[PDB]
Structure 1
Amino acid sequence: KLDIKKTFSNRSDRVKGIDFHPTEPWVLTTLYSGRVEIWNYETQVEVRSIQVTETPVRAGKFIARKNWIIVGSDDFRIRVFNYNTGEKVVDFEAHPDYIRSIAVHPTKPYVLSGSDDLTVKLWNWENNWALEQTFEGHEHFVMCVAFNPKDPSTFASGCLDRTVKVWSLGQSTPNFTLTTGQERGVNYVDYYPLPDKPYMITASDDLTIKIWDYQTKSCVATLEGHMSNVSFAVFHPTLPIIISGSEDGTLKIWNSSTYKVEKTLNVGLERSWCIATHPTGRKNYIASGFDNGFTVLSLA
């Protein structure tokens, strides 16, 4: 049963990136102010925070197996910090324009960055963070990158050019380009993580969320109801729901079978920008970042 409890919410500057640690009860937030925070959401104490830069940090992820956080900011730079010591492991210019999104491979030492420079870049931390590949083809800002968890030799990029492109690590052209019909662009793309459906999901400034079968390229469903830009939409990894968030200030939970809204939450933090789901469904935790802070919720 859906039984939504607020486990921890705190106010801060606008949070643009958010991520859960897989084994510690921690959430990373990356802020428009250039600050990043790691909170223990069970004790409600900060474990570490860093003023990384003075520009927005739009992307941030844990790399748990290396005890790192990796962040990307509007100063064009990727930085990596050890969260146990605070050491800055690396700091390099990744793109000649804003970084929108960072994804990390589940097993291999690879990080993808998507940028306003129209590209996705692949960096290898076992090769001194060498640029190993640039994926070219998109025609506007690359807003989101996500590995396919069932086949992480492939990944998806969501773009303001109104397409999603799915790529193979070996290869210079997309395996396919999805024409979303979301004419104000794609802000977010996510994969359904379970093996029973080959589904992806896209969110747009055109107020819609769409579900896609990536084998046939068909639109399975269109989810309508948000009243401003949809910043993200994701499949919960465990529960049969989809969770979206919007500049309309709401989170929406949708039934992933009927595609009808189940719950709309106004958490009171103004516009919603980002989402994380706990890597293994611990307490069904989700977390979202907003204009005025973040919240960590237990869905039941």
Structure 2
Amino acid sequence: KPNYALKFTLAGHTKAVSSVKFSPNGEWLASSSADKLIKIWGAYDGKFEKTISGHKLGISDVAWSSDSNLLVSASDDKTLKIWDVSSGKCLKTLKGHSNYVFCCNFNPQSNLIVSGSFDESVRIWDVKTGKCLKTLPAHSDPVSAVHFNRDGSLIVSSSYDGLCRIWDTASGQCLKTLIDDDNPPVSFVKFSPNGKYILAATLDNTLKLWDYSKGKCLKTYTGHKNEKYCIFANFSVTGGKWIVSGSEDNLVYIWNLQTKEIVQKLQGHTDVVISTACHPTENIIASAALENDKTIKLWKS
């Protein structure tokens, strides 16, 4: 079992936090919020660094480039924006989604950005020119999450239409469609660090680990509350191999990845823990919560 303990509580966001992400170099924590702002914090002391602004409506997601120099954010303003973190500049504003953009990620090469939206599409963008390379008619409902695999050859996406789909990044073809017996909306999905699995969350209080090549559900993680919101889940691999997730009962849940047993619950948030993140080299978890909390918390084992 892990021994995560509260260290820092981080405030500033004037509205509900939507997403928190550690920089790949482990130096920083970026956060986005319905308050239209991005904030940078020291990953180890939670020391506030800077605010990044420009979006005209709330942000639902933010993600780092591989080299920890860039950010992409996804806003209800129907744009993504590429930020240079150190200068604070908006480098590109990506436009073409017809509805709120909900989710984003760079590929590991960070020449491409993938995005998903309420306009039910998945779009691939060129980082250098900021132009939309492909629009995938990916789903029949809002796209809750999008993620590249370890080499960027694949995209996984999830949607309120109950599906999880794997896409060929080069051709844009659907290579797979995953759904279990019940068709609850899929609220989140991401590739495992080695990229052989996908972790996916459904609005039926369930996380599942899938081997997407075989189309098979390997593990199920239950015990948390997730029926209304797109809560991030994570693989934790710095110490034990855990699954980490926020919950609509204001707790952060940690399961043993292999045995599926809850090993720790983190208390202290006063609203839905919408987002959690795992530090790339230390046993640190960042957690953020919604409107009645507005705080980010940093835990260490």
Length-normalised TM-score, structure 2: 0.90
Q: In the alignment, what sits opposite 2:187?
A: 187
Q: In the alignment, what sits opposite 1:29?
A: 31
The alpha-carbon deviation at position 285 of structure 1 amounts to 1.9
> What secondary structure does 1:246 align onto?
coil
Q: In the alignment, what sits opposite 1:276?
A: 277
RMSD across aligned positions (CA): 2.0
Q: In the alignment, what sits opposite 1:249?
A: 250
Q: In the alignment, what sits opposite 1:117?
A: 119
In structure 2, the CA distance between the partners of 1:266 and 1:111, relative to structure 1 (3 Å rule), is same
> What secondary structure does 1:65 align onto?
coil
Q: In the alignment, what sits opposite 1:148?
A: 149
Q: Distance in 2 between matches of 1:290 and 1:108?
A: 28
The answer to whether the Cα contact below 8 Å between 1:7 and 1:42 also exists between their aligned partners in 2 is: no
Q: In the alignment, what sits opposite 1:222?
A: 220
The alpha-carbon deviation at position 42 of structure 1 amounts to 3.3
In structure 2, the CA distance between the partners of 1:266 and 1:24, relative to structure 1 (3 Å rule), is closer
> What secondary structure does 1:180 align onto?
coil
Q: In the alignment, what sits opposite 1:168?
A: 168
Q: Distance in 2 between matches of 1:172 and 1:204?
A: 25
Q: Distance in 2 between matches of 1:285 and 1:81?
A: 25
1:285 is the counterpart of 2:284: yes
1:105 aligns with one of 104, 107, 114: 107
Length-normalised TM-score, structure 1: 0.90
The alpha-carbon deviation at position 204 of structure 1 amounts to 1.5
In structure 2, the CA distance between the partners of 1:175 and 1:22, relative to structure 1 (3 Å rule), is same
Point out 4+ residue stretches in structure 1 off by more than 4 angstroms. none
Q: Distance in 2 between matches of 1:137 and 1:32?
A: 26
Superposed counterparts of 1:42-53, under 5 Å: 42-53=44-55
The alpha-carbon deviation at position 43 of structure 1 amounts to 4.2
> What secondary structure does 2:282 align onto?
helix
List alignment gaps of at least 5 residues for structure 2.
none
The alpha-carbon deviation at position 227 of structure 1 amounts to 3.0
Q: In the alignment, what sits opposite 1:138?
A: 139
Q: Distance in 1 between matches of 2:55 and 2:109?
A: 29
Q: In the alignment, what sits opposite 1:297?
A: 299
In structure 2, the CA distance between the partners of 1:66 and 1:189, relative to structure 1 (3 Å rule), is closer
1:199 is the counterpart of 2:192: no
Deviation larger for 169-178 or 44-53: 44-53
List alignment gaps of at least 5 residues for structure 1.
none
The alpha-carbon deviation at position 161 of structure 1 amounts to 0.7
The alpha-carbon deviation at position 108 of structure 1 amounts to 4.4
The alpha-carbon deviation at position 222 of structure 1 amounts to 2.2
The alpha-carbon deviation at position 275 of structure 1 amounts to 2.3
CA shift digits 1:236-290 (9 cap, x unpaired): 2343111111222111100111111111222223101122222x3x222221221
Q: How many residues align?
A: 293
State the one-letter code of the partner of 2:285: I
The alpha-carbon deviation at position 24 of structure 1 amounts to 5.4
The alpha-carbon deviation at position 182 of structure 1 amounts to 4.8
The answer to whether the Cα contact below 8 Å between 2:110 and 2:127 also exists between their aligned partners in 1 is: no
The answer to whether the Cα contact below 8 Å between 2:65 and 2:110 also exists between their aligned partners in 1 is: no
The alpha-carbon deviation at position 7 of structure 1 amounts to 3.3
The percentage of aligned residue pairs carrying the same residue is 25
Q: Distance in 2 between matches of 1:155 and 1:200?
A: 11
The alpha-carbon deviation at position 41 of structure 1 amounts to 3.9
